[PDB]
Structure 1
Amino acid sequence: DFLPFSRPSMGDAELAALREVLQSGWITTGPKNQALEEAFCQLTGNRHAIAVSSATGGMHVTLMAMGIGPGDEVITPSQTWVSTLNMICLLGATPVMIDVDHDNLMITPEAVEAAITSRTKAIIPVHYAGAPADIDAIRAVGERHGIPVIEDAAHAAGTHYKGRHVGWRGTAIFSFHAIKNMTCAEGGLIVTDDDELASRIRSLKFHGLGVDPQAEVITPGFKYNLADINAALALVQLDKLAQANQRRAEIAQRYLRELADTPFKPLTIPAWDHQHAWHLFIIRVDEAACGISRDVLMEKLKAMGIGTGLHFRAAHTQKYYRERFPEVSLPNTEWNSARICSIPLFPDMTDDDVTRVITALHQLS
């Protein structure tokens, strides 16, 4: 009877796809990877798609292929998952953590521009919770200074910005982790319009192998390829994505309406034209307004059989980054990081599941 904050929608279609792969005998990277990549080119309109074993690995090889390393700075929010900051550091580069908008939790072009230095080699905006960042404005800052923008689109499968899917141009990295809007348990995919970057990425995610003749190691690379077992699941889930996101939107709209007369504060919907994917439904819990703290709300909801998530504890408040970058002070991030939680949002939720959550929040206010 526990209602988790997320659960995948796996059924007979996924099992039938798995049966096909197993029957074929070709279970690692093969035709299903190619079909998934072609499908994401059709979805986004971008040129190149590279399937990978996780969005974290995708970020690792994308930054590596761009040549980012010691002496380089990478602008990123602290208000994101730690994978991006970790990959910057593990390439020897320096994350430059910037604040986010206090109500949609995404970086602004002004904050990006203020943080640019002669060392900046990449800017990594996050499309947060299913809404897009103001990517044209961020891209314009990058273009003015000759700095590439790499989009963290983990939350943005099915997100549109000014009438196009996220990643229609430039470079973006999607996630297929279990709680994402389409999942193959673990997986990811990079889209890019940059031919050379795409060529480097494909080699660096598969041992650095390339043709100088037979394939051989051109420069050392990692192992981040996606098996066809997983790619086949992702194809089924992509086929379901439009309907899944429609259901998520219906649930989120009901949360927006029925929590309007509670002190719990959702994120604000951006003013630029978009279609929200509704990956997460985040609320801010301020004890002064709500009569209950964020941590206690999570605990009491759990005691009522209702799961919640924390997306995310800001990276700069975590031990490694807190001690390496003690000077970082990001007020909007710090205020929200202490007050946000994610309430249940997934397309297998019934109307009664949603009513249960809303009733509990009303009771706990």
Structure 2
Amino acid sequence: MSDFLPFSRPSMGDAELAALREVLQSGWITTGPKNQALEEAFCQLTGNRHAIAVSSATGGMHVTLMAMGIGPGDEVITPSQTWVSTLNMICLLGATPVMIDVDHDNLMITPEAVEAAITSRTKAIIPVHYAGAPADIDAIRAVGERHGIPVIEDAAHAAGTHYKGRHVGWRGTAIFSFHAIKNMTCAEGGLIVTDDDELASRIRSLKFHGLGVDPQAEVITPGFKYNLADINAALALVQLDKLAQANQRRAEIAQRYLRELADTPFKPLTIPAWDHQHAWHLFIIRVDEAACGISRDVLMEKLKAMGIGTGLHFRAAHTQKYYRERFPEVSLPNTEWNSARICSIPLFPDMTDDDVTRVITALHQLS
């Protein structure tokens, strides 16, 4: 399978291996100075005040919602059109996810859909910056502010995303991911930025056993273990140093897909009208059987037979067994239409121009 083109691969090379050598030689391999440097780097990148490195964005979401006091009786507004981690963490704190629909062409929640779903129980709103584009975060924030409801941003796809001239997470609270397919990776990892001093203090304690000072450190309240090792933080620092060039190459690839699929029936997501810089984490197409003459599932299967990988980001959460059975009344037409028709085609900066031509040619052949 040496000729298989996956939909993503990391850009790991000599720089990463040299950073690893440095940490190994130091003998300080779990959380330490590389974590501190990564956190400082994300404060400089975003402009926000506090950065907390964690073992995954999922764990980051877990401890952020926990630190806010989210629990039984509370509602959290979220798309269904996202990764299931967020819905799972809401449920596992005992709270209730309130799933709302998304815009049919950029797959992100709207301020109107948020406002319609607010109740006296709502304790957080979690927009997703999808595929590398930002949600209309000022408008969503304005809805939250009017009701006194915090907005927690799922920025997994948004390392390098700008919104109205600032990096995502420049204010408010946002959670980044360093999973293997993310634009910067340390295999598994994540990072929370926030402007809220008390929230940051609670998060730092709750990702490391609830330890704090009452004197020596001791458990103040039970917490979890979601700290990031320095081996991983060192990889993340290298990948952050590479991120601008990685995203530039991703944008060049995505622009070519936009142009050369314009005269095919496959339908990319639409670029938001608000000012932004897209990180191009994923290149998603909608495959409508009536327009394309091929279904999404069959397209993925035939691409695979041609040696071309694809991903499904995402099967809507409310269509999956647990949520389907717990929340059977949830009906989200834009989500359901897209979830059945989307796939992610290869997009990663180590792709060659000929890799891109191979994908485009296969899509023209399969139309």
1-structure distance, mates of 2:246, 2:111: 31
1-structure distance, mates of 2:44, 2:103: 32
1-structure distance, mates of 2:341, 2:214: 53
Q: Secondary structure at the match of 1:49?
A: strand
Query: How far did residue 357 of structure 1 move?
Result: 0.1
Query: How far did residue 363 of structure 1 move?
Result: 0.1
Query: How far did residue 92 of structure 1 move?
Result: 0.1
2-structure distance, mates of 1:218, 1:49: 21
Query: How far did residue 146 of structure 1 move?
Result: 0.1
1-structure distance, mates of 2:353, 2:178: 26
Query: How far did residue 339 of structure 1 move?
Result: 0.1
Q: Percent identical across equivalent pairs? A: 100
1-structure distance, mates of 2:306, 2:44: 43
Query: How far did residue 184 of structure 1 move?
Result: 0.0
Q: Does 1:175 align with 2:168?
A: no
2-structure distance, mates of 1:363, 1:327: 40
Q: Does 1:261 align with 2:267?
A: no
2-structure distance, mates of 1:196, 1:305: 50
Q: Secondary structure at the match of 2:309?
A: coil
Give unpaired runs (5+ residues) of structure 2.
none
2-structure distance, mates of 1:295, 1:32: 43
Query: How far did residue 89 of structure 1 move?
Result: 0.1
Alignment match, 2:152: 150
User: Deviation digits for residues 90-145 of structure 1, max 9, x if unmatched?
Assistant: 00000000000000000000000000000000000000000000000000000000
Number of residue pairs matched?
365
Q: Secondary structure at the match of 1:169?
A: coil
Q: Secondary structure at the match of 1:172?
A: strand
Q: Secondary structure at the match of 1:173?
A: strand
1-structure distance, mates of 2:189, 2:9: 16
1-structure distance, mates of 2:21, 2:37: 17
Query: How far did residue 338 of structure 1 move?
Result: 0.1
2-structure distance, mates of 1:292, 1:160: 35
Q: Secondary structure at the match of 1:229?
A: helix
2-structure distance, mates of 1:130, 1:335: 21
1-structure distance, mates of 2:236, 2:353: 27
2-structure distance, mates of 1:96, 1:71: 12
Alignment match, 2:231: 229
Q: Secondary structure at the match of 2:123?
A: strand
Q: Secondary structure at the match of 1:362?
A: helix
Alignment match, 1:312: 314
User: Deviation digits for residues 260-296 of structure 1, max 9, x if unmatched?
Assistant: 0000000000000000000000000000000000000
User: Deviation digits for residues 172-218 of structure 1, max 9, x if unmatched?
Assistant: 00000000000000000000000000000000000000000000000
1-structure distance, mates of 2:36, 2:15: 19
TM-score, reference length from structure 2: 0.99
Q: Secondary structure at the match of 1:69?
A: coil
User: Deviation digits for residues 314-351 of structure 1, max 9, x if unmatched?
Assistant: 00000000000000000000000000000000000000
1:233-252 equivalent positions in 2, closer than 5 A: 233-252=235-254
1-structure distance, mates of 2:334, 2:167: 28
Query: How far did residue 44 of structure 1 move?
Result: 0.1
User: Deviation digits for residues 62-95 of structure 1, max 9, x if unmatched?
Assistant: 0000000000000000000000000000000000
1-structure distance, mates of 2:214, 2:148: 30
Query: How far did residue 308 of structure 1 move?
Result: 0.0
Give unpaired runs (5+ residues) of structure 1.
none
Query: How far did residue 352 of structure 1 move?
Result: 0.1
2-structure distance, mates of 1:347, 1:2: 16
TM-score, reference length from structure 1: 1.00
1-structure distance, mates of 2:342, 2:146: 34
Q: Does 1:364 align with 2:366?
A: yes
Q: Secondary structure at the match of 2:21?
A: helix
Alignment match, 2:88: 86
